[PDB]
């Protein structure tokens with residue numbers, strides 16, 4: 001039985017850890033809402 | 040229940056201790072999360088109940104207490120922030136330039152940041168602090184990492 005707990009305000013934060021790349025990927029979305037890689 | 044705007048953890052006691060199954064957004068009195076977090080089940084906020092209002096397994100989205108309210112979109116250019124709320128750890132902003140999911144029905148923003156599955160439903164923000172979608176529905180890549188769509192609903 002599921003419950004919620006507040007964790008923060010939704011705010012842009014100047015000078016936050018900057019990370020992650022920007023990949024362009026061919027994907028398919030199935031009726032179950034699962035993405036998959038096309039090639 | 041607590042109805043203040045912000046980001047919330049989604050918890051269960053149906054497993055060992057209290058386990059974080061995901062995250063969501065409270066905005067204008069509506070709770071927003073991903074379908075795969077709740078599977079459309081009701082939620083408790085204190086002694087208050089939140090009932091599902093709208094959901095779609097294909098979009099992997101669900102709203103509680105009202106219709107989907109979040110309508111901002113990735114510009115296609117600017118960096119964004121994942122407000123990651125990982126299990127047992129403080130909310131943390133992570134700033135990143137989205138890549139692109141190319142599909143037969145159009146291009147979607149994607150974020151290449153690796154977090155535990157219990158982070159599903161964390162909001163992705165633009166520079167004005169607007170929620171442009173939710174993190175936690177995507178794909179495992181050549182490298183073994185996770186790349187999440189920026190999943191946004193529609194506001195009617």
Ligand SMILES: Cc1cc(-c2ccccc2C(=O)Nc2cnn(C)c2)cnc1F
Pocket residue numbers: 075153154155156157158159174175176177179185187
């Ligand atoms: C170990 C592991 C983690 C994840 C994962 C990582 C980050 C955010 C979300 C997920 C996630 O579970 N998504 C998701 C979509 N639909 N279902 C049912 C589940 C994905 N795959 C894995 F193997």
